Design a protein around this ligand. Sequence first.
Ligand SMILES: *[C@@H]1O[C@H](CO)[C@@H](O)[C@H](O)[C@H]1NC(C)=O
Lengths: 39, 49
Amino acid sequence: AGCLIGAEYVNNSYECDIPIGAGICASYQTQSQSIIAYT
Amino acid sequence: YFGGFNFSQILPDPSKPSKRSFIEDLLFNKVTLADAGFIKQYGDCLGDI
Ligand SMILES: *[C@@H]1O[C@H](CO)[C@@H](O)[C@H](O)[C@H]1NC(C)=O
C-alpha cells in the first residue's frame, strides 16, 4: 500500500493494532519504546 | 480417510504458492477483475507502454 517511513519491520506476528494495508499492521511496544511494522 | 467421503476438491493443496483449493481456484479464475490500483501501479503508469 505504498511505503512506510519511521517504523522498523520485524519478523514476528501479533494482533493488528493499527491497520496499514494488505496484511501489514503497526504497533507501539518495548522491542526502549519504538514503532514497529509486522504481518 | 473421513469415512469414505472425498474432501480433496475443497481442501487446500501445498503445490500452489497460494494455499487455495480446486473450487476456490475455479471461482477466482471465473470472476474476471479490473486489476485496479490496489496493486502498485504508478511505475506502470509513468512509463508510456
Ligand atoms: C477424490 O477425487 C479425486 C478427483 O476429484 C480423485 O483423484 C481421488 O482419488 C479421490 N479420492 C479417493 C480417496 O478416491
